[PDB]
């Protein structure tokens, strides 16, 4: 069901607009190297909290 | 969501300064201007030498 945005457990602290990639245990962590980027967060989240961001 | 994601030269994170200049260059003359620093040698390779270039 093609989702435009997901809710993924943050593997660290994530700021709004941060590009995200996979982390430990499949968690979402901040990145900076295009290739690892699968989505951009739309809200701030602390480690262990869900963060919702658009795919793209 | 597009098909190609045409990156740009400056997205290539381990490219060198001369390497990026060469990748952007459009013609062989432009490449020679980047690569050959000695002006007399560049003049010989361009087939265009002054009397000063010839002496040097």
From Swiss-Prot, chain B:
Family: Belongs to the phi29likevirus major capsid fiber protein family.
One GO CC annotation: viral procapsid
Keyword flag Lipid biosynthesis: no
Functional note: Protein that forms the 55 capsid fibers. These fibers are not always present and may have been lost in some lab strains. They may enhance the attachment of the virions onto the host cell wall.
Assembly information from the UniProt record: Homotrimer. Forms a super helix coiled coil in the homotrimer.
One GO molecular-function entry: identical protein binding
Name of the protein described by the UniProt record: Capsid fiber protein
Keyword Transcription (UniProt): no
GO annotation (BP), single: symbiont entry into host cell
Primary site of residence: virion
Localization in the cell: Virion
Encoding gene (name): 8.5
Alphabetized UniProt keyword annotations: Host-virus interaction, Late protein, Viral attachment to host cell, Virion, Virus entry into host cell
